[PDB]
Amino acid sequence: SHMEELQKSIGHKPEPTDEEWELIKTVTEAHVATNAQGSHWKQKRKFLPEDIGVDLEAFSHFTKIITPAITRVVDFAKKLPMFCELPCEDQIILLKGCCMEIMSLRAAVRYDPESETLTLNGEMAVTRGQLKNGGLGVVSDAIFDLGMSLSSFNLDDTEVALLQAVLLMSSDRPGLACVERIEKYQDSFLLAFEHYINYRKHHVTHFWPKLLMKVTDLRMIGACHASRFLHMKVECPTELFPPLFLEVFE
Ligand SMILES: N[C@@H](Cc1cc(I)c(Oc2cc(I)c(O)c(I)c2)c(I)c1)C(=O)O
């Protein structure tokens, strides 16, 4: 009985309703499925040679593995019924919007402080420099700084999945038709996410506000990548652009 605000005047911290656990199980599984190499990534990963890394040899490695990265985000979305409930133009609009946001999140949570690397596609471990010089520029710094910061959040697969869901259901992308409906699905994810955090009892003060701030930072990564993507088309050759890469980023 979502009295919600009232339960937040008394100071109780509401856990997930029965319906919310269902939504949480769906999003979680969507993610775990489409997350290249689940919990097995730290030993499955080849460090890219110190000598590689606009440095074009670098770029070519990242573009080689980017089409599967993209598609595993479309797959994450497909596995959300709310996404299925939307028109075809809206779906494409939402994906193009969140694709880098999600991929960046997936990379940043595989930050390893021992090596100072992130791991892409669960397949390849890069440094900040290698990722910067291979085309991202300062978006690399953005992602590394983020990964470094999410170290203390200790996110679990559910937390990352819900974050992905919040990024996907963004009502402000341009061109959308079903805005109010996307906002409602969003609010539904945020409400379950908060609830799930209450349940997790993280030992960090002001955990939720803090994690919402990361949504923004992800958004910024994405914006900033759009711009990097123009700087790229002029520097690297139309040749090394996987078709799907082009179609998502336009
Ligand atoms: N690790 C994620 C996927 C992921 C793949 C790549 I490859 C990547 O790096 C780039 C590099 C360039 I250059 C681009 O132009 C773009 I978009 C992404 C990032 I960050 C994330 C996953 O597990 O799903």
Coordinates of C-alpha atoms and ligand atoms in Angstrom, one line a residue:
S1 CA 0.0 0.0 0.0
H2 CA 2.3 2.7 -1.4
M3 CA 1.6 5.4 1.3
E4 CA 5.4 5.9 0.4
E5 CA 5.9 9.4 1.5
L6 CA 4.3 8.7 4.8
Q7 CA 6.5 5.6 5.4
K8 CA 9.3 8.2 4.7
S9 CA 8.0 10.6 7.3
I10 CA 8.1 8.0 10.0
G11 CA 11.6 7.0 8.9
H12 CA 11.1 3.5 7.8
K13 CA 13.0 2.4 4.7
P14 CA 10.6 0.3 2.6
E15 CA 11.8 -2.9 1.0
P16 CA 10.5 -4.4 -2.2
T17 CA 6.8 -5.2 -2.6
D18 CA 6.0 -8.6 -4.1
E19 CA 5.4 -7.1 -7.5
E20 CA 8.9 -5.2 -7.2
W21 CA 10.7 -8.5 -6.5
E22 CA 9.2 -9.9 -9.6
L23 CA 10.5 -6.7 -11.6
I24 CA 13.8 -7.0 -10.0
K25 CA 14.2 -10.7 -10.8
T26 CA 13.3 -10.0 -14.5
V27 CA 15.8 -7.1 -14.8
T28 CA 18.5 -8.8 -12.9
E29 CA 18.3 -11.9 -15.2
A30 CA 18.2 -9.8 -18.3
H31 CA 21.4 -8.4 -17.3
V32 CA 23.2 -11.5 -16.0
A33 CA 22.4 -13.1 -19.3
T34 CA 23.8 -10.4 -21.4
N35 CA 26.7 -9.6 -19.4
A36 CA 29.7 -11.2 -21.3
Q37 CA 31.4 -13.8 -19.0
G38 CA 29.3 -13.2 -15.8
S39 CA 31.5 -13.6 -12.6
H40 CA 34.3 -15.4 -14.5
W41 CA 35.8 -12.2 -16.2
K42 CA 39.0 -11.6 -14.0
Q43 CA 40.9 -14.7 -15.2
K44 CA 39.2 -14.9 -18.7
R45 CA 40.8 -11.5 -19.7
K46 CA 43.8 -10.7 -21.9
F47 CA 45.6 -7.5 -21.1
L48 CA 46.2 -5.5 -24.3
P49 CA 50.0 -5.1 -24.8
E50 CA 51.6 -1.9 -23.2
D51 CA 52.8 -1.1 -26.8
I52 CA 49.4 -0.7 -28.3
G53 CA 48.1 2.8 -27.7
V54 CA 44.3 9.1 -32.6
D55 CA 46.3 5.8 -32.3
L56 CA 44.8 3.7 -34.9
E57 CA 46.0 0.2 -34.1
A58 CA 44.2 0.7 -30.7
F59 CA 41.2 1.9 -32.3
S60 CA 41.0 -1.1 -34.6
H61 CA 41.1 -3.6 -31.6
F62 CA 38.2 -1.6 -29.9
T63 CA 36.2 -1.5 -33.0
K64 CA 36.6 -5.2 -33.7
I65 CA 34.8 -6.0 -30.3
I66 CA 32.3 -3.3 -30.3
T67 CA 29.5 -4.8 -32.5
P68 CA 29.0 -7.7 -29.9
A69 CA 29.0 -5.1 -27.0
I70 CA 26.3 -3.2 -28.7
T71 CA 24.2 -6.2 -29.4
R72 CA 24.3 -7.5 -25.8
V73 CA 22.6 -4.1 -24.8
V74 CA 19.9 -4.6 -27.4
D75 CA 19.5 -8.1 -25.9
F76 CA 19.3 -6.7 -22.4
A77 CA 16.5 -4.5 -23.5
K78 CA 14.6 -7.1 -25.4
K79 CA 14.4 -9.1 -22.2
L80 CA 12.4 -6.3 -20.5
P81 CA 8.7 -6.6 -21.2
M82 CA 8.2 -2.9 -20.7
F83 CA 10.6 -2.3 -23.6
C84 CA 8.6 -4.8 -25.7
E85 CA 5.5 -2.7 -25.0
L86 CA 6.8 0.2 -26.9
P87 CA 6.7 1.3 -30.5
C88 CA 9.4 0.5 -32.8
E89 CA 10.7 4.1 -33.4
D90 CA 10.7 4.6 -29.5
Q91 CA 12.7 1.4 -28.9
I92 CA 15.3 2.5 -31.4
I93 CA 15.3 6.0 -29.9
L94 CA 15.9 4.6 -26.4
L95 CA 18.6 2.3 -27.5
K96 CA 20.7 4.8 -29.4
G97 CA 20.3 7.0 -26.3
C98 CA 21.6 4.5 -23.7
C99 CA 23.9 2.4 -25.6
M100 CA 27.1 4.2 -24.5
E101 CA 25.8 4.9 -21.1
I102 CA 25.3 1.2 -20.5
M103 CA 28.5 0.0 -22.1
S104 CA 30.3 2.5 -20.0
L105 CA 28.7 1.3 -17.0
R106 CA 29.5 -2.3 -17.9
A107 CA 33.1 -1.3 -18.4
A108 CA 33.4 0.8 -15.2
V109 CA 32.2 -1.9 -12.9
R110 CA 35.1 -4.1 -14.2
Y111 CA 37.6 -1.7 -13.0
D112 CA 40.6 -3.5 -11.3
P113 CA 42.7 -1.4 -9.0
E114 CA 45.6 -4.0 -8.9
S115 CA 46.3 -3.5 -12.6
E116 CA 44.7 -0.1 -13.1
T117 CA 42.6 -1.6 -16.0
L118 CA 38.9 -1.9 -17.1
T119 CA 37.8 -4.8 -19.0
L120 CA 35.9 -4.6 -22.2
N121 CA 33.4 -7.1 -23.4
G122 CA 34.7 -9.2 -20.5
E123 CA 37.2 -10.1 -23.3
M124 CA 40.0 -7.2 -23.1
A125 CA 41.8 -5.3 -20.3
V126 CA 42.9 -1.7 -21.1
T127 CA 44.6 1.1 -19.3
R128 CA 43.3 4.7 -19.1
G129 CA 46.0 5.7 -21.7
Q130 CA 45.2 2.9 -24.1
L131 CA 41.5 3.7 -24.0
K132 CA 42.1 7.5 -24.3
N133 CA 44.6 7.2 -27.3
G134 CA 42.5 4.7 -29.1
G135 CA 39.7 7.2 -29.6
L136 CA 37.8 8.0 -26.4
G137 CA 40.0 10.8 -25.2
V138 CA 38.7 12.3 -22.0
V139 CA 35.7 10.0 -22.1
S140 CA 38.3 7.4 -21.0
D141 CA 39.1 9.5 -18.0
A142 CA 35.4 9.9 -17.3
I143 CA 34.9 6.1 -17.3
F144 CA 38.0 5.2 -15.2
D145 CA 37.2 7.9 -12.7
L146 CA 33.8 6.4 -12.4
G147 CA 35.0 2.8 -12.1
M148 CA 37.3 3.9 -9.4
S149 CA 34.5 5.5 -7.6
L150 CA 32.0 2.6 -7.9
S151 CA 34.6 0.5 -6.1
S152 CA 33.2 1.6 -2.8
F153 CA 29.6 1.2 -3.9
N154 CA 29.9 -2.5 -4.1
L155 CA 27.2 -2.9 -6.6
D156 CA 25.7 -6.3 -7.1
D157 CA 24.3 -7.5 -10.4
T158 CA 20.8 -6.3 -9.5
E159 CA 22.1 -2.8 -8.8
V160 CA 23.9 -2.6 -12.1
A161 CA 20.9 -4.0 -13.9
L162 CA 18.5 -1.5 -12.4
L163 CA 20.9 1.3 -13.2
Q164 CA 20.8 0.0 -16.8
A165 CA 17.1 0.0 -16.8
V166 CA 16.9 3.5 -15.5
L167 CA 19.3 4.6 -18.3
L168 CA 17.3 2.8 -20.9
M169 CA 13.9 4.3 -19.9
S170 CA 14.8 8.0 -20.4
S171 CA 11.9 10.2 -21.4
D172 CA 13.9 13.1 -22.5
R173 CA 15.4 11.6 -25.5
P174 CA 14.5 13.5 -28.5
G175 CA 11.9 12.1 -30.9
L176 CA 10.1 9.9 -28.5
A177 CA 6.4 9.4 -28.9
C178 CA 5.4 7.6 -25.7
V179 CA 7.1 10.0 -23.1
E180 CA 4.5 9.6 -20.4
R181 CA 4.7 5.9 -20.6
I182 CA 8.5 5.8 -20.6
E183 CA 8.4 8.0 -17.4
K184 CA 6.1 5.7 -15.7
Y185 CA 8.3 2.6 -16.4
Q186 CA 11.3 4.6 -15.3
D187 CA 9.6 5.6 -12.1
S188 CA 8.7 2.1 -11.6
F189 CA 12.3 1.0 -11.9
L190 CA 13.6 3.8 -9.6
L191 CA 11.1 2.8 -7.0
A192 CA 12.0 -0.8 -7.0
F193 CA 15.8 0.2 -7.1
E194 CA 15.4 2.4 -3.9
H195 CA 13.5 -0.3 -2.3
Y196 CA 16.2 -2.7 -3.2
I197 CA 18.8 -0.5 -1.8
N198 CA 16.9 -0.3 1.5
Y199 CA 16.9 -4.0 1.6
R200 CA 20.7 -4.1 0.9
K201 CA 21.7 -1.8 3.7
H202 CA 24.8 -0.6 2.2
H203 CA 27.2 0.9 4.8
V204 CA 27.5 4.3 3.2
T205 CA 25.8 7.3 4.1
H206 CA 23.4 8.8 1.7
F207 CA 23.8 5.9 -0.7
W208 CA 20.7 6.5 -3.0
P209 CA 21.5 10.2 -3.7
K210 CA 25.0 9.2 -4.4
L211 CA 24.0 6.5 -6.8
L212 CA 21.6 8.9 -8.7
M213 CA 24.5 11.2 -9.2
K214 CA 26.2 8.3 -11.2
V215 CA 23.2 8.2 -13.5
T216 CA 24.1 11.8 -14.5
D217 CA 27.7 11.1 -14.9
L218 CA 26.8 8.2 -17.2
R219 CA 24.6 10.5 -19.1
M220 CA 27.5 12.9 -19.5
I221 CA 29.8 10.1 -20.6
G222 CA 27.3 9.4 -23.3
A223 CA 27.0 13.1 -24.4
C224 CA 30.7 13.5 -24.4
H225 CA 31.1 10.3 -26.5
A226 CA 28.7 11.7 -29.2
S227 CA 31.1 14.5 -29.6
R228 CA 34.1 12.2 -29.5
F229 CA 32.3 10.3 -32.2
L230 CA 32.4 13.3 -34.5
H231 CA 36.0 14.0 -33.8
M232 CA 36.6 10.4 -34.9
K233 CA 34.8 10.3 -38.2
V234 CA 37.0 13.1 -39.3
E235 CA 40.3 11.6 -37.8
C236 CA 39.9 7.6 -38.3
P237 CA 38.8 6.3 -41.7
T238 CA 35.1 5.5 -42.7
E239 CA 36.7 2.1 -43.3
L240 CA 37.2 1.0 -39.6
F241 CA 33.6 1.6 -38.6
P242 CA 31.5 -1.4 -38.0
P243 CA 28.1 -0.9 -39.4
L244 CA 26.3 -1.3 -36.2
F245 CA 28.6 1.3 -34.6
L246 CA 27.6 3.7 -37.3
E247 CA 24.0 3.1 -37.1
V248 CA 23.8 3.6 -33.3
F249 CA 25.8 6.8 -33.1
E250 CA 24.5 8.1 -36.4
Ligands
LIG1 N1 32.6 -3.5 -21.6 C1 31.3 -3.3 -22.1 C2 31.3 -2.9 -23.6 C3 32.3 -1.8 -24.1 C4 33.0 -2.0 -25.3 C5 33.9 -1.2 -25.8 I1 34.9 -1.7 -27.6 C6 34.1 0.1 -25.1 O1 35.0 1.1 -25.6 C7 34.5 1.8 -26.6 C8 35.5 2.4 -27.4 C9 35.2 3.2 -28.4 I2 36.7 4.0 -29.5 C10 33.9 3.6 -28.8 O2 33.9 4.4 -29.9 C11 32.9 3.0 -28.0 I3 30.8 3.3 -28.2 C12 33.2 2.1 -26.9 C13 33.3 0.4 -23.9 I4 33.7 2.2 -22.9 C14 32.5 -0.6 -23.5 C15 30.4 -4.5 -22.0 O3 30.9 -5.4 -21.2 O4 29.3 -4.7 -22.5

